[PDB]
Amino acid sequence: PAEAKYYIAGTITDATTGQELTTAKVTLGDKSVTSSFNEQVNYKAEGYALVVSADGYYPVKRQVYLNQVSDGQTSVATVNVALVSVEAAVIPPVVPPTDPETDINEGEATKVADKAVEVAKPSESTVTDMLAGTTATPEEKKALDETLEMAGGMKVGETTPEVLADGSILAITPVKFTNPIQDAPAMVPYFYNEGCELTGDVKEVAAPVAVAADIQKAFLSNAAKALNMNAGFVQKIGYTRISVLNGYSILGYTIKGQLVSKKLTFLISGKYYEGIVSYQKSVMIYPNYYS
C-alpha cells in the first residue's frame, strides 16, 4: 500500500477585492512559489513556513501544518492568504484569532455544523468541473478520463457533518464509482473552500431586555481581515491518485473537509457583536477499497 501523500495548496488574494495577487512574493518552506500554488511535501511535525508580501499590503507569515493520514490516503493543507492593503479601513476584533479565547469547543461546533456543511458542500458548478476536468493539467485530465472510462462515472453524494471533540467539523462528501475499478489506479477529483463564512448567528453581546444584514456583512468583512482570508467561500479543485491495492477493487472514495472555527467580537456602530466564522484548514482523500 502506498505511503500517505501530503500537499499544500492555496491562493494569495487581495482581502478587499478577492482577486489573486499575481505580483505577490511567496515562499513555502525553502521554495519560491506563485500566488496560485500546489506543492507536494514530506510530512514534518514542524510544518512549513508560508511567507507572503506585496507592495502596498501588510506582509503575512503563516506556519502550515499537515493533517496526518494513513497509507493510501492524501492530505492537503488548504491555505488562503488574503493580504490587507495599508489603505484599507479595518475594525480590529476585541481579541485576535491567535488568542485561545477565540477557539470553539465541541458544543459550539455542534450548533454551527449544519450551516457549516451547507456553505462548505460542493456546488453544482464545482461538481461539474471536478468530473469534466475543467481545471486539470493535461496529465491529470488524461488520467481522469482513463479512470472514468473504467469506473463508468462518479456520483458525488450528499455532504454530511461529523463534529470532532476538538471543535473542528468534517464535511464528509462521498464519491461512488458506478463500477468498481479492478486492479488499476484511479485519478480522482477533490475540492476545497478558500475564504471564511459566517456559520453561527451574529448576536449583540450584553443586549438590554435579530441583527441587521449590514451589521452581519460588516462583522464577516472584519472577521475575514482578522483571519487574512476572503469573506465568502470560493471553491477550488484538485486531482490525486488512488494507487492499486492488490486483491482489492476501488469502489470510490470519501472527501473529508476539515472546517475550523473562531468566535470573534467586534465593536460595530457603537455596539459589540459576536459570531462564529468557519474556514477550511485541510481536505483529505480516503479511498474505499473492497476485497
Grid coordinates representing 287 are 479511498
For 172-284, where are the alpha helices, taking DSSP H only?
Answer: 213-227
Question: Do the beta carbons of residue 117 and residue 161 sit within 8 Å?
Answer: yes
Of 94, 125, 134, 275, which Cα lies nearest the Cα of 200? 275
Return the HEC string of 124-181: HHHHHHHHHCCCCCHHHHHHHHHHHHHHCCEEECCCEEEECCCCCEEEEEEEEEEEEE
Domain hosting 182: range is 1-291
Enumerate residues 6+ apart whose C-beta is below 8 A from 4: 43, 68, 69, 70, 71, 72, 73, 74, 75
Question: Distances in Å between the alpha carbon of 199 and those of 71, 118, 150?
Answer: 33, 9, 39
Q: How many residues does the structure list for the chain?
A: 291
Q: What is the DSSP letter of 183?
A: S
**What does the alpha-carbon distance between residue 228 and residue 82 come to, in Å, rounded to a whole number?**
5
Grid coordinates representing 120 are 462548505
Of 119, 117, 128, which Cα lies nearest the Cα of 256? 117
Grid coordinates representing 118 are 451547507
Q: What are phi and psi of 51, to 5 degrees?
A: -120, 125
Question: Do the beta carbons of residue 283 and residue 79 sit within 8 Å?
Answer: no
106 in helix, strand or coil? helix
Domains in the chain: how many in total? 1
Q: Are strands 5-14 and 25-28 parallel, antiparallel or unpaired?
A: unpaired
Enumerate residues 6+ apart whose C-beta is below 8 A from 209: none
**What does the alpha-carbon distance between residue 171 and residue 148 come to, in Å, rounded to a whole number?**
24
**What does the alpha-carbon distance between residue 46 and residue 48 come to, in Å, rounded to a whole number?**
7
How many beta carbons lie within 10 A of that of residue 127, not counting itself? 20
Grid coordinates representing 8 are 499544500
What's this structure's resolution in Å?
Answer: 2.2
Q: What is the DSSP letter of 20?
A: B
Solved how? X-ray
Q: In the chain, what is the greatest distance between 2 CA atoms, to the nearest angstrom?
A: 67
